[PDB]
Amino acid sequence: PTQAGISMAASAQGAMVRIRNPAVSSSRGGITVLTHSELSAEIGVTDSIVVSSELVMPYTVGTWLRGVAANWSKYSWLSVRYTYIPSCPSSTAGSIHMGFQYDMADTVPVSVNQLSNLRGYVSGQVWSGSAGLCFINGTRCSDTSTAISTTLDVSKLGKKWYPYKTSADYATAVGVDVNIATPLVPARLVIALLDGSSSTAVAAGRIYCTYTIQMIEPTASALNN
Amino acid sequence: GITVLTHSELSAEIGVTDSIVVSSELVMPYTVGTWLRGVAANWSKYSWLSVRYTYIPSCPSSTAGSIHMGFQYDMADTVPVSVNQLSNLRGYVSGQVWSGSAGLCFINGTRCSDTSTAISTTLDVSKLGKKWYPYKTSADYATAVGVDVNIATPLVPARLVIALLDGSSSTAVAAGRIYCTYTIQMIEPTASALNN
Amino acid sequence: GITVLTHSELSAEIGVTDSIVVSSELVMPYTVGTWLRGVAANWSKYSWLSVRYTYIPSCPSSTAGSIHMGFQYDMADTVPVSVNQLSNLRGYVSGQVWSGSAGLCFINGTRCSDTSTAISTTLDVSKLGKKWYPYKTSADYATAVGVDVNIATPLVPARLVIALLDGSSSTAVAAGRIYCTYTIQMIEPTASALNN
Amino acid sequence: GGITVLTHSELSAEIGVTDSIVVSSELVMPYTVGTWLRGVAANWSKYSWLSVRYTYIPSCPSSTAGSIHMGFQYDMADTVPVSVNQLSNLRGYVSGQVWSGSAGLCFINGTRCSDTSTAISTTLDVSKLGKKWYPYKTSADYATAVGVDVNIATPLVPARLVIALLDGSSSTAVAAGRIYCTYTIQMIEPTASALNN
Amino acid sequence: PTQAGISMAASAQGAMVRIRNPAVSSSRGGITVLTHSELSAEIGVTDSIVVSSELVMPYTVGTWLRGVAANWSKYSWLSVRYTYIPSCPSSTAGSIHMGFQYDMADTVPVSVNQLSNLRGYVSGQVWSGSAGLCFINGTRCSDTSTAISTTLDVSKLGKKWYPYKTSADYATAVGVDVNIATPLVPARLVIALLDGSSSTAVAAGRIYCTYTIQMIEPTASALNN
Amino acid sequence: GGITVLTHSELSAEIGVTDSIVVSSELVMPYTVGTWLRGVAANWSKYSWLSVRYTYIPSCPSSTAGSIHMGFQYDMADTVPVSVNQLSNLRGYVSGQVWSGSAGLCFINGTRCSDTSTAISTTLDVSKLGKKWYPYKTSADYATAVGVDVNIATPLVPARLVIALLDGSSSTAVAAGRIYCTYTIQMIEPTASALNN
Ligand SMILES: [Ca+2]
Ligand SMILES: [Ca+2]
Ligand SMILES: [Ca+2]
Ligand SMILES: [Ca+2]
Ligand SMILES: [Ca+2]
Ligand SMILES: [Ca+2]
Hints:
Subcellular location (chains B, C): Virion
Binding site for Ca(2+) (chains B, C): 74, 77, 135, 195-196
Largest sheet of chain A: 6 strands, antiparallel
Helix content of chain A: 10-25%
Number of strands of chain A: 11
Structural class of chain A: mainly beta
Largest interface: A-D, 33 and 35 residues
Oligomer: part of a larger assembly
Main location (chains B, C): virion
Shape of chain A: globular
Protein name (chains B, C): Capsid protein
Number of helices of chain A: 5
Bound molecules: calcium ion
Family (chains B, C): Belongs to the icosahedral plant coat protein family.
């Protein structure tokens, strides 16, 4: 693109990811702030729709964050962002879909449509979204009108302060009744993948999450459940 | 970036007897009334802004019987059993099954001057558990409470308790109706058929 | 360069029963009342400015039964069938067939302070289909709707739905009356006998 | 006061891409824009469009030959375009390659829009519609009315979106993209859900 | 392209077309000026050469222009431009060819060669020409050295003023003898498509025409033939 | 207006001093803080902590070997500290000789506090609690709920006070001191006494 309205589709997009060292700061008053990025999930697309879901809580979001936040009893999301990066060619067939849900009791979407309604929805070709790189690496952002990434509206969730929960104990409590969950986690991410070309899954891309968290009220790592 | 509406609708039809009859309504969207149920369901959460349960008679000057309403918030708390019990709960209200004729203005918001008579009460949104509650279905709620009641205080805000007595007969009598005049902020949209 | 008047007149006499009785009135000049019918007909068009249907009892303290009114605008919409249905429609209103005694002041516009009790509602001229509707006759209207209902939303603004129940008997009972207090702008004159 | 204002963005129609110019049309009214709104808008008798915007969003390979077209008609009586040519005349004519438009995305999530010149999307000229307020009509009852005479519809629906999907590479369908609608609406004069037609 | 001489071919080109409202102006003296753009024709390419021809007169050029100019007895072309937009991938095989002829009696070209000689000739890959978008949308023009579009040299035709003719009556008159046509239409566009890959036609692109016309001497729409 | 604000100071728990580290815990809620408040708070459905402060006050000889520890946990699901070490991590960890703290006294009678550095006392960080308002829960009903699953408690109680009483000189108990609580509370949504659970 030189003029206006003209667009050139590459044979394939490429984004070189480099995650910078974590950012931690113990701000007097109690809170310890952490802002970091981590590869949150691996993606694959098929000709039939597939709905994947991931809880947006510490233990689940980040693999590093898991071990970190463990030393604090509570936490408050300050900014959670799931960005998508395509690791395939434009010759690949397929689209992605993401959005959030807030009451785990609600059934998980089953149509690209139902999902179009969720909060912070996003769709786009499996081979696009490279634009969002500047988010993950943390550089100066250019044109993001083409990027595939959504953010959690921390502005309005159940509480500001949630308890650090462990996948294990969590599930155990959800086993009793799902509902016990709402006071354990803010919301969850919904991810759909359809419009693919083969019955056997194909390498689509990957989703990195870049968050900023507040951690409070310390505890021995192993005393936390 | 939300969506806010205000409306009024019959929340439940009332009948009086010779003995006390204690009933209760959750103050959540699904259980307030038909309309707000079928709508608010298209949003994952919601926050009460102004809940008002108003009673409005349907009987003759000559139809002995009174009515009582109040609130409760810790669902685990035992449901009242005497008119006295109910007098204690917050935002109480008593009156003859045929009174409250004036509580009408509350539903067609106009020049509401004379509202002393009015048999209606208001939910103190000002301070309930959380501020944003998730939309729940009659079904899924009872299901969860079936385990333990307390899983409810994080699911609903409070519930309106009601009692009718000092009736003319021992068999139900055409009393009146309770309408709810609510204003709500609903958010985080979702396919209607997906909400539980 | 128009012509504007304001008046009030009996729009329909009411009766209550043991079962629900749903009736409806178009909110067009011809169907509001005798007077405004025989006048507004001398003008091709008209625009509502303030429509108010007010109920006024005629029975004794002891005459069980309630009354309900609300509006609808897409004539094609199905006419309500339960008190609940009617509670949903806009500008609802409920009350005992003997109440509304105070809705009187609305017809002899004076010092209307106490109007809570008042069983009356208002048409939101503020926003209906068109702003200038043509004067139509009961006859010619039904004739056109006989083809398809929808030819009506361009002919009338909205219609008032009414229901009466919780009655004392199973055979009509002297209830009250509904009067209409309207203010209208009528234009583009025409021989009375020519309007359809 | 009195009204109620929803502003949302949901899938309005999935698109199949072929070689034989198939031409469709959707009414620009609540019951038709999308499933979600259809569900809500029902609780209100009339409504008025404030800002209606259909936006095409791809979901296919770059190796997918094809172009898509959109436009508006307002006298429901007019004959739906027979040729894409005829279509290129309508108000808000727009057309691009069935795999481009990736940029239009900023209309669906309501983010900060950078350059939207490459976005396959058109809007509704609300200021020039017959009535300000329309009646919520169900596809059913509408058809029944247009059955007697189409003109009885000009007062039930503001406009119609004409969509053409020509140029492809195969004789059968190939999933291409979706057309989401991002509308701002004023819903009024509430009513029981099942009583609306 | 950063340096000079280096060129990058996209997997596929994309041009988002948006036609702006017509431009009409009744300039005292008689003439009514109209400048508008319309999708003039649909394109397809095959392995064997195909020669298409379109008269460059009101009734034929534009589908809207047809109904408009009907209300005037004569017209004078002021600027006629046929632009091409590719709606396919660079992986597609094929080239286009356009030019003008002025004496309908002349036989229609049959070789990409003969056509190379015509006035305002143009050739180019079926999947290119996206550059010309700025013409149709009517934006600021960038590098057009790559665009596939030609213009009618209004400077030198039979008359300046031609009569509005209808396809019907026209053909009827040409049925008598083709020659009667020269005083009925200025010239015509020739379009060839060969160098394709399949025997069965493939979706190539589409040709939009952007013209500026002068219309004069009014008449009841239906009295015009 | 509407609320009701009590601010009081009563014995929250008597302390026995031994040599084998015995570790206890008390919920930081009305029914558990103390007998008096338990009695009042019942007349109100919900409540919100404004300022909670547990203070240890001796009542033994200076020849009484022993140390006491206090701290807070908030995810009721977490395992109550097994070692005093684990405890020294919690928010508001504090610990001193079971005969000192004489100075903390100025927290109970509400007098003018001179130097309180030697006082064995910690406070509750109210600004960082899950909910602002909690439901008054009876130990009974609470246990019954945590019986099904502990997590069902995180929304019933703000935090838990972990107390450790290690280091002593005898194998049996020796009266050491008391932990009084000095709280300021907002009681709301009144209710019949016996109807609260
Ligand atoms: Ca924990
Ligand atoms: Ca829900
Ligand atoms: Ca007339
Ligand atoms: Ca309707
Ligand atoms: Ca002619
Ligand atoms: Ca309680």
